RNA sequence: UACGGUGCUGAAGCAACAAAUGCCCUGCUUCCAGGAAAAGCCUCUAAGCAUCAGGUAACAUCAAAUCGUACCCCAAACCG
RNA sequence: UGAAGGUGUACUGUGAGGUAUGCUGGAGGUAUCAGAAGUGCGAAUGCUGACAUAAGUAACGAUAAAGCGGGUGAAAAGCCCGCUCGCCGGAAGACCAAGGGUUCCUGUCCAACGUUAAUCGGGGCAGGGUGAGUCGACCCCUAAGGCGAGGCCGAAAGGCGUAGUCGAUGGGAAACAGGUUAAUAUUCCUGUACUUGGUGUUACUGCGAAGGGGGGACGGAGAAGGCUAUGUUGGCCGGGCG
RNA sequence: AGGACCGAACCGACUAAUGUCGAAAAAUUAGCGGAUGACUUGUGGCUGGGGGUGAAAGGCCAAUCAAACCGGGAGAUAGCU
RNA sequence: UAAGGUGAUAUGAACCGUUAUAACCGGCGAUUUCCGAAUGGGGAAACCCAGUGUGUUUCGACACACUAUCAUUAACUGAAUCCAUAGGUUAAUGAGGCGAACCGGGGGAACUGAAACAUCUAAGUACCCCGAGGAAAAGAAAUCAACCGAGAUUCCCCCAGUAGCGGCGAGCGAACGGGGAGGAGCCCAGAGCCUGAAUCAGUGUGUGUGUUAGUGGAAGCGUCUGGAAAGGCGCGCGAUACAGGGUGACAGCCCCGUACACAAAAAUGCACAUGCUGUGAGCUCGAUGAGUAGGGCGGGACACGUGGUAUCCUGUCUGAAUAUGGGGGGACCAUCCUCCAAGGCUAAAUACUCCUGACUGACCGAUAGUGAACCAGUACCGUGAGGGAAAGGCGAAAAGAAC
């Protein structure tokens, strides 16, 4: 009966993507964290 | 016209039923080309290396299959094939 | 500077083939030689469909550790430790006690 | 930003103490005003955002002497 | 072969590059995939012999 | 006839009537709540330029790259 | 010539314990007196793994429905072929977008996965399969809106915004019929077309934007008229005489 | 003409029974309300936590809301078990 | 360096070598796709799309370079408007982003404690931001002291839980003085006779002696159990080497090391000569930091909560004397004493360890030790930020079980 995740790759990338993160001071720090932790998938891309 | 590099375009001839049926009946050759490799470059390469009269080149990108074996996933490389149609002066 | 090497008559110091002598077939990277007629192991070779398919047991020459073998002197008539020295420009081996060159 | 071009007076912080000494954070902004100064060296008006005390430094020194110090730091006016 | 290839002309040394690419690499690459080639070692040494030349003709 | 078919042939291939929520219709009447933008496109000339450069037709010849193209898609392949 | 550990047995101390030893085990162990503690577990709806119980119990996911004959096979209610029966048919059909991401197709295999079996499968394992000037994206323009040189503003971070530049869900050139593959087809083939560019010849001639104008270019409802998709019935054609 | 009428799609959710270790962390079945409008829906945008948004119910803001979620202060503190 | 090499799971196939042109390990290079500050414009990172010139080309078009922004600098130039300025062009140089902690600044909580709570505490703590450097800050007295004296700064030990501060509660808590580590000083607000002298400054430059490859490197034997001897027993031998690890059980002498003796074509880190684009001592003479010190007002910092409250900082409004001058000595005053503010610079002792090398543990030994001994920040979970596992061991040798 209509769940929360209703996927859309445009929305996904525009919202959470690499360039979306790069755009902002705080979004750049997220990447700096995921790199510091050492994640394989740095963003969803 | 693009000397030296033309040699790097054509990787190998492709072997299949669909490839074979298109030898005699359609007068084409199917072949694995470089991931770059434009239809002009494939044509110009066949025109020099194989040295035959090319009518037109059709091209596509084949997606690699995800082969999970043992306990690890691993996908094949994406490779590009080119159906190269030949003129009436044909051989191989 | 490997002390035991390719075309070299050795004698076995330890193991079921203690006292036997033979030539080295090939030294391995791991530090193990394959001396002929020494570690004879009776392998059960499975008849693989492709190429040859004999189907039978075979006495293969297994590997032995380098420290289990010493070069045969052929003068004293026993095992001897190897050294290294510079005779002429090149480096060469020698027997400790009865200082000869190989 | 609320910064005097002459003195460099910027907004400092501090408390706003009540009768019962309830410390609540505040700011002390400086008395800034965009004012036009006649530079008699090159015959024109120069607009500067200065504190009231800035104006007194410009009165005490020369406008050209202050602009000389402003130009050394790498500013515009 | 390097010591011999080093003493060559800048125009003449291209002809060896083009000869290494023209046949050899291409021919063996096409012959390998068709299943006519037994000697697989040739693919390696040709690729290294190109690199040698393409290194050698970067003199400026 | 591998029982799959496959090359060969291959007749008629019209008229009436009914008929859309499609199309004409970005129409028409009509109403008040008064109904995107910008290029492509046609047109006009300044700054310019005058046996130039451009346009115009008719023609010939090239050129049209690259990526997607399987499959499911009111579902066992999506979200649960 | 058998350590620790495991497992029994027999002695033994007031107790926590200790000693000896059979079997298993196959390389460690440690007297003594000292020294130091991650020093002792039955509970904390403690924590992790294992394993019970209920129990061979409920359940096996729409009450659209099966039946039989033959085939393959170690085995067939379920797979294949056939013939009946049934159910959907503004869908439970057929194409798409989004979203998945090889599930497609072929051969092969039945451990696990499938709420049963499985010779079957969207399962395992190999190998194939996605062909475009015209379909879509790309590109061209823009909406809401995002970003935004200078800028204005803000302790710093940054905020807003001009020129611009992005941003479709909208506007903007052109391809259709039939044939074909185990699997693609407005893409391959055959038959007919069409569009926008670049580039040479001829005969003419007043051309050129960051500009002007036109156009693109737009609402709801309603009503009618003509059409077509399509359907029906004759006609013609090929079989049919039960 | 109409926030007109009846009625499918579509949007809803008044009654009942079922279901409640479900077919389903809100559904099914049979009825039920709106159905040219203050309608409905696709695609993309904007508003952010004492903040948003709200034809107002403390409703809604990713199955979480009288103050979201994640990380941190942090082993908060617990005269209690 | 070298007789075995073509990395691993992980074999096969085809090869490559043996006294040196295989592999292997280092120094210096060459290449160095795309994304990413990303920088030609854009963008849903790993894609789309160009401009300009150049140089070839068979109509088709190839190849390589450039082209971000900003900040200084310079030349072209240049609107309202006469002069110029704003602006616009290209070039020179630099900046941009990432990274563990430590460091200095700009902001800056609350839970908590006070047995409630609001001053106070937690605490200038967590966190956010900015800017550095191998350290950073401080720093050569307008400092203390007590009529005695010291002599920049930082860090350690006391002084001392002292004096004080404090809803005089909870709590906060110095300084003087003493002992140590470490030591060092200078430059401008400029005239003199005279001047390259001290000094730090290019860089070469021989040097030293490290770093990045390495080379040599002693001495064991027989019997007894046993699958296997390094073990038992007997006889030896080395030891500037008995650290350690491997080898079919526990090896000084089997192997690899070890002590020790050595070793560089090339690149570099230091420590002395040192030619020097390029840099001034000593003198005399002076000068000696103004919207400044101080004050009023409001805040903050000082152990010190406005209190009798010195001292420091400054948002605000004011405002001296400037060396017969002024600051300080904890309200304030007068004598005595001591210093010279309103401009700068400066090594060492000190803090830290993403990372590199060796070594060490009354540290852990697979529910421990990292989350991660295993291909783990993985599978998996979440739209996302983010969370986040389980999983070690055949044997001495695959001899991994032909039939
Ligand atoms: K039927
Ligand atoms: K705390
Ligand atoms: Mg979104
Ligand atoms: Mg941060
Ligand atoms: Mg994370
Ligand atoms: Mg991800
Ligand atoms: Mg074609
Ligand atoms: Mg294509
Ligand atoms: Mg791959
Ligand atoms: Mg407070
Ligand atoms: Mg004005
Ligand atoms: Mg180069
Ligand atoms: Mg048939
Ligand atoms: Mg009709
Ligand atoms: Mg009908
Ligand atoms: Mg109209
Ligand atoms: Mg036209
Ligand atoms: Mg015209
Ligand atoms: Mg053509
Ligand atoms: Mg073409
Ligand atoms: Mg399709
Ligand atoms: Mg289908
Ligand atoms: Mg279907
Ligand atoms: Mg469908
Ligand atoms: Mg449905
Ligand atoms: Mg369907
Ligand atoms: Mg569910
Ligand atoms: Mg599902
Ligand atoms: Mg015994
Ligand atoms: Mg005994
Ligand atoms: Mg015994
Ligand atoms: Mg025993
Ligand atoms: Mg025994
Ligand atoms: Mg025992
Ligand atoms: Mg023990
Ligand atoms: Mg015991
Ligand atoms: Mg038993
Ligand atoms: Mg028992
Ligand atoms: Mg015993
Ligand atoms: Mg016994
Ligand atoms: Mg036993
Ligand atoms: Mg052991
Ligand atoms: Mg042991
Ligand atoms: Mg022991
Ligand atoms: Mg014991
Ligand atoms: Mg003991
Ligand atoms: Mg102790
Ligand atoms: Mg315990
Ligand atoms: Mg207990
Ligand atoms: Mg227990
Ligand atoms: Mg377990
Ligand atoms: Mg049963
Ligand atoms: Mg029961
Ligand atoms: Mg029952
Ligand atoms: Mg039952
Ligand atoms: Mg059932
Ligand atoms: Mg049933
Ligand atoms: Mg049934
Ligand atoms: Mg039969
Ligand atoms: Mg049978
Ligand atoms: Mg069978
Ligand atoms: Mg049968
Ligand atoms: Mg059979
Ligand atoms: Mg049979
Ligand atoms: Mg049978
Ligand atoms: Mg049967
Ligand atoms: Mg049957
Ligand atoms: Mg059935
Ligand atoms: Mg059937
Ligand atoms: Mg059928
Ligand atoms: Mg029905
Ligand atoms: Mg119907
Ligand atoms: Mg379609
Ligand atoms: Mg899926
Ligand atoms: Mg995919
Ligand atoms: Mg699969
Ligand atoms: Mg299938
Ligand atoms: Mg099968
Ligand atoms: Mg079975
Ligand atoms: Mg199996
Ligand atoms: Mg089953
Ligand atoms: Mg089940
Ligand atoms: Mg199948
Ligand atoms: Mg399958
Ligand atoms: Mg196209
Ligand atoms: Mg069309
Ligand atoms: Mg699109
Ligand atoms: Mg294009
Ligand atoms: Mg355009
Ligand atoms: Mg645009
Ligand atoms: Mg707008
Ligand atoms: Mg805009
Ligand atoms: Mg903006
Ligand atoms: Mg600019
Ligand atoms: Mg600027
Ligand atoms: Mg700006
Ligand atoms: Mg303004
Ligand atoms: Mg902004
Ligand atoms: Mg605009
Ligand atoms: Mg669109
Ligand atoms: Mg169009
Ligand atoms: Mg379109
Ligand atoms: Mg069209
Ligand atoms: Mg058709
Ligand atoms: Mg046809
Ligand atoms: Mg036909
Ligand atoms: Mg199909
Ligand atoms: Mg055609
Ligand atoms: Mg024709
Ligand atoms: Mg014709
Ligand atoms: Mg025509
Ligand atoms: Mg047309
Ligand atoms: Mg045309
Ligand atoms: Mg216009
Ligand atoms: Mg429109
Ligand atoms: Mg309308
Ligand atoms: Mg109406
Ligand atoms: Mg009417
Ligand atoms: Mg009509
Ligand atoms: Mg018709
Ligand atoms: Mg028709
Ligand atoms: Mg009829
Ligand atoms: Mg008949
Ligand atoms: Mg009848
Ligand atoms: Mg109305
Ligand atoms: Mg109505
Ligand atoms: Mg009625
Ligand atoms: Mg009704
Ligand atoms: Mg629907
Ligand atoms: Mg309902
Ligand atoms: Mg509902
Ligand atoms: Mg009722
Ligand atoms: Mg009922
Ligand atoms: Mg129940
Ligand atoms: Mg039930
Ligand atoms: Mg209902
Ligand atoms: Mg009713
Ligand atoms: Mg009704
Ligand atoms: Mg009604
Ligand atoms: Mg909806
Ligand atoms: Mg939306
Ligand atoms: Mg938003
Ligand atoms: Mg909140
Ligand atoms: Mg918050
Ligand atoms: Mg807020
Ligand atoms: Mg508000
Ligand atoms: Mg509402
Ligand atoms: Mg209420
Ligand atoms: Mg909720
Ligand atoms: Mg609620
Ligand atoms: Mg709350
Ligand atoms: Mg709250
Ligand atoms: Mg949330
Ligand atoms: Mg902490
Ligand atoms: Mg707690
Ligand atoms: Mg070596
Ligand atoms: Mg061979
Ligand atoms: Mg060489
Ligand atoms: Mg060499
Ligand atoms: Mg590289
Ligand atoms: Mg960019
Ligand atoms: Mg560049
Ligand atoms: Mg640049
Ligand atoms: Mg770029
Ligand atoms: Mg797009
Ligand atoms: Mg100038
Ligand atoms: Mg002008
Ligand atoms: Mg002018
Ligand atoms: Mg530049
Ligand atoms: Mg440059
Ligand atoms: Mg910087
Ligand atoms: Mg930086
Ligand atoms: Mg700090
Ligand atoms: Mg800091
Ligand atoms: Mg700090
Ligand atoms: Mg602060
Ligand atoms: Mg508090
Ligand atoms: Mg509180
Ligand atoms: Mg309290
Ligand atoms: Mg309390
Ligand atoms: Mg309370
Ligand atoms: Mg701070
Ligand atoms: Mg921070
Ligand atoms: Mg920063
Ligand atoms: Mg250091
Ligand atoms: Mg440095
Ligand atoms: Mg410093
Ligand atoms: Mg300093
Ligand atoms: Mg100072
Ligand atoms: Mg001084
Ligand atoms: Mg002095
Ligand atoms: Mg001093
Ligand atoms: Mg004295
Ligand atoms: Mg003294
Ligand atoms: Mg002293
Ligand atoms: Mg009181
Ligand atoms: Mg404190
Ligand atoms: Mg304390
Ligand atoms: Mg004293
Ligand atoms: Mg002393
Ligand atoms: Mg001292
Ligand atoms: Mg001392
Ligand atoms: Mg010392
Ligand atoms: Mg010292
Ligand atoms: Mg001393
Ligand atoms: Mg010294
Ligand atoms: Mg001195
Ligand atoms: Mg001094
Ligand atoms: Mg001065
Ligand atoms: Mg030395
Ligand atoms: Mg050595
Ligand atoms: Mg040795
Ligand atoms: Mg014996
Ligand atoms: Mg013997
Ligand atoms: Mg005996
Ligand atoms: Mg015996
Ligand atoms: Mg035996
Ligand atoms: Mg022995
Ligand atoms: Mg014994
Ligand atoms: Mg002796
Ligand atoms: Mg020993
Ligand atoms: Mg053992
Ligand atoms: Mg012993
Ligand atoms: Mg011994
Ligand atoms: Mg040892
Ligand atoms: Mg001994
Ligand atoms: Mg020494
Ligand atoms: Mg040297
Ligand atoms: Mg030498
Ligand atoms: Mg050198
Ligand atoms: Mg001074
Ligand atoms: Mg001054
Ligand atoms: Mg003062
Ligand atoms: Mg003051
Ligand atoms: Mg005073
Ligand atoms: Mg004072
Ligand atoms: Mg005052
Ligand atoms: Mg007053
Ligand atoms: Mg005052
Ligand atoms: Mg005051
Ligand atoms: Mg106060
Ligand atoms: Mg205080
Ligand atoms: Mg008092
Ligand atoms: Mg008093
Ligand atoms: Mg005083
Ligand atoms: Mg003075
Ligand atoms: Mg004096
Ligand atoms: Mg004097
Ligand atoms: Mg006086
Ligand atoms: Mg005085
Ligand atoms: Mg003093
Ligand atoms: Mg003082
Ligand atoms: Mg005084
Ligand atoms: Mg006093
Ligand atoms: Mg005092
Ligand atoms: Mg004092
Ligand atoms: Mg006085
Ligand atoms: Mg002074
Ligand atoms: Mg003086
Ligand atoms: Mg002062
Ligand atoms: Mg001072
Ligand atoms: Mg001051
Ligand atoms: Mg000051
Ligand atoms: Mg000073
Ligand atoms: Mg320095
Ligand atoms: Mg130093
Ligand atoms: Mg030590
Ligand atoms: Mg130890
Ligand atoms: Mg330990
Ligand atoms: Mg252990
Ligand atoms: Mg663990
Ligand atoms: Mg264990
Ligand atoms: Mg375990
Ligand atoms: Mg963890
Ligand atoms: Mg996920
Ligand atoms: Mg295990
Ligand atoms: Mg193993
Ligand atoms: Mg083992
Ligand atoms: Mg077996």
UniProtKB/Swiss-Prot annotation, chain A:
GO terms for biological process: translation. GO terms for cellular component: ribonucleoprotein complex; ribosome. The keyword Nucleotide-binding does not apply. InterPro entries: Ribosomal_bL34, Ribosomal_bL34_CS. The keyword Acetylation does not apply. PROSITE patterns: RIBOSOMAL_L34. GO terms for molecular function: structural constituent of ribosome. Keywords: Ribonucleoprotein, Ribosomal protein. It comes from the Bacteria. HAMAP family: Ribosomal_bL34. Belongs to the bacterial ribosomal protein bL34 family. This is Large ribosomal subunit protein bL34. It comes from Escherichia coli O45:K1 (strain S88 / ExPEC). The gene is rpmH.
Curated annotation (Swiss-Prot), chain B:
Disulfide bonds: none annotated. Belongs to the universal ribosomal protein uL23 family. Keywords: Ribonucleoprotein, Ribosomal protein, RNA-binding, rRNA-binding. This is Large ribosomal subunit protein uL23. SUPFAM superfamilies: Ribosomal proteins S24e, L23 and L15e. GO terms for molecular function: rRNA binding; structural constituent of ribosome. InterPro entries: Nucleotide-bd_a/b_plait_sf, Ribosomal_uL23-like, Ribosomal_uL23/eL15/eS24_sf, Ribosomal_uL23_CS. The keyword Ribonucleoprotein applies. One of the early assembly proteins it binds 23S rRNA. One of the proteins that surrounds the polypeptide exit tunnel on the outside of the ribosome. Forms the main docking site for trigger factor binding to the ribosome.
Swiss-Prot record, chain C:
This is Large ribosomal subunit protein uL24. HAMAP family: Ribosomal_uL24_B (MF_01326_B). One of two assembly initiator proteins, it binds directly to the 5'-end of the 23S rRNA, where it nucleates assembly of the 50S subunit. One of the proteins that surrounds the polypeptide exit tunnel on the outside of the subunit. GO terms for molecular function: rRNA binding; structural constituent of ribosome. Pfam families: KOW (PF00467), ribosomal_L24 (PF17136). It comes from Escherichia coli (strain 55989 / EAEC). Gene3D superfamilies: 2.30.30.30. The keyword Iron-sulfur does not apply. Coiled coil: none annotated. PANTHER family: MITOCHONDRIAL RIBOSOMAL PROTEIN L24. The lineage of its organism: Bacteria, Pseudomonadati, Pseudomonadota, Gammaproteobacteria, Enterobacterales. One of its GO terms (biological process) is translation. Part of the 50S ribosomal subunit. GO terms for cellular component: cytosol; ribonucleoprotein complex; ribosome. The gene is rplX. NCBIfam families: rplX_bact.
From Swiss-Prot, chain E:
One of its GO terms (molecular function) is structural constituent of ribosome. CDD domains: Ribosomal_L29_HIP. The keyword DNA-binding does not apply. InterPro entries: Ribosomal_protein_uL29 (IPR050063), Ribosomal_uL29 (IPR001854), Ribosomal_uL29_CS (IPR018254), Ribosomal_uL29_sf (IPR036049). One of its GO terms (cellular component) is cytosolic large ribosomal subunit. It holds the Pfam family Ribosomal_L29. SUPFAM superfamilies: Ribosomal protein L29 (L29p) (SSF46561). This is Large ribosomal subunit protein uL29. Belongs to the universal ribosomal protein uL29 family. The keyword rRNA-binding does not apply. Gene3D superfamilies: 6.10.140.1970. It comes from the Bacteria. GO terms for biological process: translation. Keywords: Ribonucleoprotein, Ribosomal protein. Signal peptide: none annotated.
């Amino acid at each position: 009966m209509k769940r929360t995740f209703q996927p859309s790759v445009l929305k996904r990338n525009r919202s959470h993507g690499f360039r979306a993160r790069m755009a902002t001071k705080n979004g750049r720090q997220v990447l700096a964290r995921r790199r510091a932790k050492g994640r394989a998938r740095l963003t969803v891309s | 016209i693009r000397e030296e590099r033309l040699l790097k375009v054509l990787r190998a001839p492709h072997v299949s039923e669909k490839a074979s049926t298109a030898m005699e009946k359609s007068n084409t050759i199917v072949l694995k080309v470089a991931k770059d490799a434009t239809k002009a470059e494939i044509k110009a390469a066949v025109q020099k290396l194989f040295e035959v009269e090319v009518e037109v080149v059709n091209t596509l990108v084949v997606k690699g299959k995800v082969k999970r074996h043992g306990q690890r996933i691993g996908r094949r490389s994406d490779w590009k094939k080119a159906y190269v149609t030949l003129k009436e002066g044909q051989n191989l | 500077a490997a002390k035991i090497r390719r075309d070299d008559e050795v004698i076995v110091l330890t193991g079921k083939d203690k006292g036997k002598r033979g030539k080295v077939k090939n030294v391995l990277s791991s530090g193990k030689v394959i001396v002929e007629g020494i570690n004879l192991v009776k392998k059960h070779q499975k008849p693989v469909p492709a190429l040859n398919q004999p189907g039978g047991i075979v006495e293969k020459e297994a590997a032995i550790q380098v420290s289990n073998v010493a070069i045969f002197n052929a003068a004293t008539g026993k095992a001897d430790r190897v050294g290294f020295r510079f005779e002429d420009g090149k480096k060469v081996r020698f027997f400790k006690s009865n200082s000869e060159t190989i | 930003s609320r910064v005097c071009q002459v003195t460099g007076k910027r907004p400092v912080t501090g408390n706003n103490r009540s009768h019962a000494l309830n410390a609540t954070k505040r700011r002390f902004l400086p008395n800034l005003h965009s004012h036009r100064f006649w530079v008699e060296s090159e015959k024109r008006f120069v607009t500067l955002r200065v504190s009231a005390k800035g104006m007194r430094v410009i009165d005490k020194k020369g406008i050209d002497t202050v602009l000389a110090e402003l130009r050394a730091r790498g500013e515009k006016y | 072969m390097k010591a011999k290839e080093l003493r060559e002309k800048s125009v003449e040394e291209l002809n060896t590059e083009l000869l290494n690419l023209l046949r050899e690499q291409f021919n063996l690459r096409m012959q390998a995939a068709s299943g006519q080639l037994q000697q697989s070692h040739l693919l390696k040494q040709v690729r290294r012999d190109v690199a040698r030349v393409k290194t050698l003709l970067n003199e400026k």
